[PDB]
Paper text:
BAR protein endophilin B1 plays a key role in multiple cellular processes critical for oncogenesis, including autophagy and apoptosis. Endophilins are a highly conserved group of N-BAR proteins that contain an N-terminal amphipathic helix (H0) and a 20-residue amphipathic insert in helix 1 (H1i). These two motifs contribute to membrane association. BAR proteins are typically dimers in solution, where the dimer consists of three α-helices from each monomer that form a 6-helix bundle with a characteristic crescent shape.
Numbering used by the authors:
A (entry chain A), B (entry chain B): 11 to 76, 91 to 252
The structure:
Amino acid sequence: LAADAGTFLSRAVQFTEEKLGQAEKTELDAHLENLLSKAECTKIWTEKIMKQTEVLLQPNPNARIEINNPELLGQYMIDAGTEFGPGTAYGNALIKCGETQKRIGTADRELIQTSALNFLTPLRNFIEGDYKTIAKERKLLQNKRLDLDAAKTRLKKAKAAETRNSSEQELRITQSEFDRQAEITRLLLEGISSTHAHHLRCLNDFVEAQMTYYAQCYQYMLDLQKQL
Amino acid sequence: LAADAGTFLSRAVQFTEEKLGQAEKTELDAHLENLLSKAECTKIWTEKIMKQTEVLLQPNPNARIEINNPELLGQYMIDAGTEFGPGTAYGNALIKCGETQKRIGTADRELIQTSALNFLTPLRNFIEGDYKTIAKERKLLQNKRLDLDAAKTRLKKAKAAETRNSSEQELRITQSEFDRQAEITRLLLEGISSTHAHHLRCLNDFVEAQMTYYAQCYQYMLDLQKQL
């Protein structure tokens, strides 16, 4: 209850003095330190790639917030050709081109849905399922470290019998707690390795989707050329 | 000088009477009417098609007013690969994919240059030339028609035989200018026939451009698949 509030205040004091430079800072084991850094970079890069991919798939920002451009152009062409006269060669071409443009529009929508269910979703799930969990452990680990240094300062300021005696007992518990949290954090950080391999498989899926999209559109264009 | 004001007054008054329905309106010959309508329709439809084509090629409105999305995504992927370790399989894939994404971006830029100069330019030229010239002559033709109807109104209101004879001469003068302007506009309207044939060749060029873009992109994607 109220005790919770007091503990928070003490933590800030230690943090400030460390930044002030009048206090030193305990360093985590290199292995754990390296693991923490690796996870951070993974989230940073994955976020950027996913966001830009969405912009590429749906160029219209308003549509991304939400008829695709290709089909709209096809609609105008068909209507114009009818007015210009279906028999007239110019009208004939406009009508056929409009139809082909609409077929291309269909292929685009298929690609967007396919990519989202095989690429955007898995990458997003990683941050939602793994990163968020790791974030919680990271915060708790830092909290324990702050308390350890705070007790250390008291032990350094040993000027009385009870001070020395209590400091030793207090530090013993603080050290053990920090060590316990370290083990749990290490385990989760170890899972990141599998995350990379999983993401690799999803990347292959995105590449395949684009190939199919371009192949379908190419054939559609070839047909229009023959008809025209 | 004062003549300018006088001419405006006569035209507006007669027009208002016709609008009110109290005054009758001299109609034009069917041939000229048909030609004028055809030209107007051509410009309206051509304007819409060209504008939508611009949106399709350059989805970004700001860029349309002026790096492409594909190349930017390529940059992110290559950078991430390095951090994740070029040797690492995940890093290798990210780097290769980014490179191909930039190549696709390059082909897009070529299409924009090729298409705009072979499709948008001609459509715009027609609207900037054939239509405008016709509109100017069409406006003067309406002014001449108003002068003719004003002369007819003066003629019917010319109770005095001598005044009516003067109105007959005035009517002949207005009729001659009116007929002359009709012929001038008619000649410009005949030009729209050639515009359609020219526009058809331009449409074929736009189709060819799109086919090349899709073909090149397909090959690029195929190569990336093999390397990965």
